[PDB]
Ligand binder design. Sequence first.
Ligand code: HEC
Length: 106
Amino acid sequence: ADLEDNMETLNDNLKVIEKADNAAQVKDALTKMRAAALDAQKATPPKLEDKSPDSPEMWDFRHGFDHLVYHIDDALKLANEGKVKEAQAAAEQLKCECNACHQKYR
Ligand code: HEC
C-alpha cells in the first residue's frame, strides 16, 4: 500500500489500542501496525524524492521504522504476557515518538 494509507493504519490502530479492554484486541491492532510499518519502510516520501536510498535522509527514514517495529514488538510481547495496561502505556509513549520523523520529512 502507499505511505499515506500505512500512516492511517498506524494512527487508527493507536486509537484502537487505547480504547481496548482485552489483550487480544491490543495484539491484533499492534499486528496491523507492524505490517503497515514494514510496508511504509519501503516507500519514498514526497520531500525525499530527490534522494537516493543510501542518502543519510533515506537511511534515517528507514531506520525510524526499524525502531517503530522495535517498540511494536515489545508492546506485542507485553500483550502476549496479558499486560493490557502496560501494553497500552507502551503504545502511548510509542505514539509520542511518531512526531520526530514527521518533523524531519513530512
Ligand atoms: C518516518 C520514519 C515516519 C514515522 C516513524 C512515522 N511517520 Fe507518519 N508520516 C511520515 C511521512 C514522511 C508522512 C507524509 C506522507 C505524505 O505523503 O505526505 C507521514 C504522514 C502521516 C499521517 C498523515 C497521512 C495523510 O493522509 O496525510 C499520519 C496520520 C501519520 N503519518 C501517522 C503516524 C503515526 C501515528 C506514527 C507513529 C506510529 C507515524 N506516523 C510514524 C513519516 C513517518
